[PDB]
Amino acid sequence: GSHMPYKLQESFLNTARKKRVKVSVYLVNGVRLQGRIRSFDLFTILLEDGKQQTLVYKHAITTIVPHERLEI
Amino acid sequence: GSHMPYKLQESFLNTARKKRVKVSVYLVNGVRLQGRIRSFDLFTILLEDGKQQTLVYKHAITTIVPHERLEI
Amino acid sequence: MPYKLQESFLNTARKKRVKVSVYLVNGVRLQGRIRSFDLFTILLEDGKQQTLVYKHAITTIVPHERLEI
Amino acid sequence: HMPYKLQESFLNTARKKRVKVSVYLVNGVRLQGRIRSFDLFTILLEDGKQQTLVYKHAITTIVPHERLEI
Amino acid sequence: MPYKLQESFLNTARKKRVKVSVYLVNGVRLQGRIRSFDLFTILLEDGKQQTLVYKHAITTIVPHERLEI
Amino acid sequence: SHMPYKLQESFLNTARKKRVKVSVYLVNGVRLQGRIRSFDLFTILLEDGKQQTLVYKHAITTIVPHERLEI
Ligand SMILES: [Cl-]
């Protein structure tokens, strides 16, 4: 079909978001963030860990590892 | 459906700007900037801390953490 | 064709279920099989664990078997 | 409609006012000088006699040594 | 002609089968011959081992013989 | 004095035509040295004696000419 350049990334993020799965978000400098994905757009992800919000730039992420299996 | 590619990033930055909330801006090299968001555009953010202005390139940011909760 | 090599490499590793090492800019080495990929990301699987990898963080991908691309 | 409004105003004001700046790089190096020119991807810094072409992709922050009226 | 130099350099090294050193942003040095390339990746071969290299991770490519570009 | 467009192109082309030695500093602290033989949108070809080096611009932090450039 047509070009869908975000099909995997969008499905992964939306599934983690909708299922409220805790994720580890690893950054290029080795820092590991932890929380749930509250929202995301083209270039950013909003992580929530308790009462703390963190806006994460995707360009700084190496990997996202869910703490439960996602049925993507 | 509809997706807006900047809605999260713009709402986060604009709410912190309008509410004058102090933020920590973490950089790829581990440096942590602190201040208030005075302005922003597609690729840069203008931080203010006391009398000092800093132009930050978004490509160097890993995360932004607000010091108060943002109602987004 | 801007993606002819990259797409052929990733798809062959995916279809043949070949283990790969994915080396990152910071020296971390991931290991697993490529389950899926799109323009900017690759889904790795290692046993039960899934990992979404951003291509911008990858330096090299090394297959554990020879790929007939 | 104005994706560069802040970046251009900041760089152009520093350039026109000949304000000394610190340009911090991703690897921690701190350049110093005045902005002589800039384009989409680069900034030309002058520190006395020496010219340096800086790639914006390597910059983390620019800190002016005097307040910029922007 | 945004790729005139890059394409000529990579194609000449590929066609002449010249060994190259590919230096990465983190200081790792890969070695091999360029088997193929596209817009964003290079396929390096060192004997039996294939490595897909993302160009965004490369700092420099140094050929081990002079290329008549 | 201001090239809000074409600064990079003018700088690189002036160093190339004048055969000025440059230091090319990389993101990881490595300093390359040579003359710019050619360049395109994303790469620069450095020459240092008999050795050619293709440099990706995305890895460069700064380029410092060893003589003043009249851009
Ligand atoms: Cl898509």
DSSP secondary structure of D15-44 = HHHT-EEEEEETTS-EEEEEEEEE-SSEEE
Vertex B2: Cα angle to A68 and B5 (nearest 5) = 75
The resolution in angstroms reads 1.5
Q: Residue E42 burial (CB < 10 Å; 0-12/13-18/19+)?
A: buried
Asked whether the CA dihedral A49, A55, A60, A64 is positive or negative, the reply is positive
- At residue F27, the 3 state secondary structure works out as coil
Is residue D60 within 8 A of residue B60, CB to CB? The reply is: yes
**What's the one-letter identity of residue D48?**
G
- What single-letter amino acid sits at F5? Y
C39 Cβ under 8 Å from any chain A Cβ: yes
**E11 to chain F: which residues are within 8 Å by CB?**
none
Q: Note whether A9 contacts C41, CB cutoff 8 Å.
A: yes
Nearest by CB to B64, from A33, A43, A55: name it: A55
Q: For the purposes of burial, counting CB atoms within 10 Å of the CB of F64, is it exposed (0-12), middle (13-18) or buried (19 or more)?
A: middle
Q: In the numeric block, which tokens belong to residue F35?
A: 């003359």
Structural domain boundaries, residue A4: 1-72
Contact between F40 and E5 under an 8 Å Cβ cutoff? The reply is yes
Tell me which method was used to determine the 3D structure.
Answer: X-ray
Torsion angles phi and psi, residue F41, rounded to 5: -60, -45
Q: How far is CA A56 from CA A43, A53, B37, C46, E69, in A?
A: 9, 10, 16, 25, 43
Spell D1-30 as b/e; 16+ CB within 10 A means b.
eeeeebbebbbbebbeeeeebebbbbeeee
Please give the C-alpha separations between residue E22 and each of C25, C60, E26, E44, E51, in angstroms, as whole numbers: 14, 11, 12, 9, 11
Q: Rounded to whole angstroms, how far apart are CA atoms A15 and C4?
A: 30
Q: Is E2 on the interface with C (CB under 8 A)?
A: no
Nearest chain B CA: its distance from A40 CA (Å)? 6
DSSP E6-45: HHHHHHHHHHHT-EEEEEETTS-EEEEEEEEE-SSEEEEE
- Residue type (1 letter), E47: G
Number of H helices, E strands in chain D: 1, 5
Number of domains making up chain E: 1
Contact D68, D14 (CB under 8 A): yes
Give chain D positions within 8 Å (CB) of B28. 26, 60
Of C41, C48, C49, the CB nearest to A8: C41
Mind telling me how many Å the CA of D69 is from chain F's nearest CA?
20
Q: The tokens 């026109």 sit on which residue?
A: D16
C30 in Cβ contact with E65 (< 8 Å)? no
Closest CA to C46 of C27, C20, C8: C20
Phi then psi for residue D20, to 5 deg, are: -65, 140
With an 8 Å Cβ cutoff, is E18 touching chain C? no
For chain F, say whether E6 makes contact (Cβ under 8 Å): yes
Tell me the pairing of strands E58-63 and F51-56.
Answer: antiparallel
CB D45 within 8 A of CB F65: no
Min CA distance, B62 vs chain D (Å)?
11
Place of tokens 């490499």: C9
Half-sphere exposure of F28 (CA within 13 A, CB side): 15
DSSP reduced 3-state for F50: coil
CATH number at residue A48: 2.30.30.100
